[PDB]
Amino acid sequence: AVLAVRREDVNAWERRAPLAPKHIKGITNLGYKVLIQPSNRRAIHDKDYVKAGGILQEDISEACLILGVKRPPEEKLMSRKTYAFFSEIRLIDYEKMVDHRGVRVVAFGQWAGVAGMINILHGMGLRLLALGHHTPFMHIGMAHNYRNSSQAVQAVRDAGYEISLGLMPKSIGPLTFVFTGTGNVSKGAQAIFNELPCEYVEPHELKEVSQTGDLRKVYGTVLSRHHHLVRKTDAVYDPAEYDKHPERYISRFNTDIAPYTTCLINGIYWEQNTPRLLTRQDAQSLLAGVEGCPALPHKLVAICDISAGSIEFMTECTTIEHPFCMYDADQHIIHDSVEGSGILMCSIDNLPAQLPIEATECFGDMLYPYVEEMILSDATQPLESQNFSPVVRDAVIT
Amino acid sequence: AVLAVRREDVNAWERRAPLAPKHIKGITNLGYKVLIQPSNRRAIHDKDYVKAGGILQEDISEACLILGVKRPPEEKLMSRKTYAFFSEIRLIDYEKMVDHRGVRVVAFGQWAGVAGMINILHGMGLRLLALGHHTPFMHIGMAHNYRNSSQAVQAVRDAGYEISLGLMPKSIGPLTFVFTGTGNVSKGAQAIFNELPCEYVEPHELKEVSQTGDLRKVYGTVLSRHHHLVRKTDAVYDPAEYDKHPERYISRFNTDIAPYTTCLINGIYWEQNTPRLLTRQDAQSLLAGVEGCPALPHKLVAICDISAGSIEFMTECTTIEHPFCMYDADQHIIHDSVEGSGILMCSIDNLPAQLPIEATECFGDMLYPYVEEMILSDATQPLESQNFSPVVRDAVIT
């Protein structure tokens, strides 16, 4: 009954771990031995795991359970072990772990939305500067440039102060931020947004707010289903019918919301037959004063996907290293650019890795209650004789 | 006698101005009318110039003196005016303005070194992560990601705290920073460095310090002439002779200092016949443990030029938008990269533009005493009848 946390070697930016030091201290308090494979790549230092009770050791052959974040290289797999990561060995997949209602019980929580909102604010500063406008958004870095969300929140506060002081350029007009989805990632992105001088309005007020809104505030709206979903046949919205039959519905976001949106934070988790927020034809419609102080070429400036479908023209993803691309009027995707015409787009598949300490502590909190039954399992013995809960059992891939 | 501050249209990153609001208030207190051409690109907002007493006006035909930072487009030049910028019209060039000893009296001071040191610390974090090592340097953004040097200093303090807590990876070993030059840009880069847990040592101690130095500190050294300059014939250093005859001297930096240097901050202003710090052959010599915690491939990780010659293989410059490049073992320069083998290099020609408010206030402080004689000048009348000081007179290009 020995547990090991393997070293991540997926990519250079995988700095997360499946368990935090406080979780290792709890496991060692229960009487279980924990081996920690040394890793300079981890955002949490090896000495903090040692202080919690873990043993720093390269050879993890003694452990029967090996916990990692991402896939291990196939050659590094040890036979007759139980492995858990994101994908005679028993393999447990975190993403398959669900409760009796089917909701995932082990994830990174809101941190992808927190990181995504910082990134898009940073990207909006660069994009607006490329258009000729210095804004306080120039004073927000990328999410991974901050030690944690607290230090990032202070930077968002400071840029919010500049906006409330009236330091935004008057000619670009009011800024409107639209949040979609009901998951925890949308709550995380809204948490960062609430640190600005924000005012929340209903979707139907965007048309007026986008024109006459106060320039010392930013404006936000939370898009619910009933605001934009209509039946294909007669534009009716029925909550019960849409849940059972989403294929009968379309979205009027492209005409009712999109033209009045400066920045779209898309957190919708796309499912089968769910209507799309924007199509390629919508992008062409959306992309259709003084020399020193020009107006924006288009109202829509940026789109940030934090769900990692809804946006048909967003067929490619960006990375932490190259966070932004432009979708131009010729339907071309220009990678690692904020220049030219078009919409700034950000779609990073591992957002929580930009805030890896808080992402590790959140992931470990969710995983911790299922750890003990994993340690006591035996990969050589049949699955049916293991004392698993349905959460762990149904997550076994082998 | 009307003064105008034109709008900068050089590039998107030219956010500086030749005069700050406090300077405009002084000029208006003297009784002079100041026109401010509106600019969303300026880091200091138009309303702060209005509050100081300036008049926001696109047409600046009334002014006889037009102050800008960089070159104006040739078509925008107005005849029979006096212009001052960096390069029947009279043209004054800031760089030509010198005192009786020949020292420049109008410049951006230390701010290029302040910005350059932040950039290189940010670049070292990315480069070390690419090598497999998470370090606190990941929590320092680019200079232009900070509102001012105060907000940047706080981020350097916070990363310094992490280093003093022991969060650096042990396998990369001690970090040594070498500062060259005696100008104000070197003082600015040292000012940022002093916010880390630093200890200064003599150049001869680098050999030992680079091996056994405390890993909860960073180490710095200031390189003076007598540390590395030797006569070609007999390796003698004579201060008076080197000043008169630098062509008789060479630098032993490549063998005595370079092998023990983690990061070189080059502030030397290169002059005719001054010996080079490093050559192309030196780079080949410099580029000639556990799997989880490897050692550095080479001791030298990064070089940042803040002087904008000394380093023969640094034949190309980087930009604010693409700050870093790699010089590999094949003598190739890989732009916009921190990956692969080689030395990380940063050489931005307009560093102070990354801290444009403080750079503007510094530049304006130096320019302010010469402004009044420029306003009272007449570009149509002969230069010899103008009441100029030698500083302004000798700076006229026409």
Residue numbers in the entry:
A (entry chain A), B (entry chain A): 24 to 110, 130 to 330, 338 to 357, 361 to 450
From the paper:
AASS is a bifunctional enzyme with an N-terminal lysine-2-oxoglutarate reductase (LOR) domain and a C-terminal saccharopine dehydrogenase (SDH) domain, which are homologous to Saccharomyces cerevisiae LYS1 and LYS9, respectively. The LOR domain catalyses the reductive deamination of L-lysine and 2-oxoglutarate into saccharopine (EC 1.5.1.8), which constitutes the first committed, and possibly rate-limiting, step in lysine degradation. The LOR domain itself consists of two lobes, both Rossman folds with a central beta-sheet with alpha helices on the outside.
We initially purified a short construct (amino acids 21–451) that expressed well in E. coli with high purity and a monodisperse peak on gel filtration. Importantly, we solved the first crystal structure of the human LOR domain at 2.2 Å resolution. Some of the extended loops and predicted catalytic residues were not visible in this structure. Moreover, when we tested this short construct for activity, we discovered that, despite the fact that it was well folded and aligned nicely with the yeast structure, it had no activity in our in vitro assay. (a) Asymmetric unit of the short inactive construct shows a dimer of the LOR domain of AASS. One paradox to resolve was why the C-terminus is so critical for activity, despite the fact that it is distant from the active site and the shorter construct is well folded.
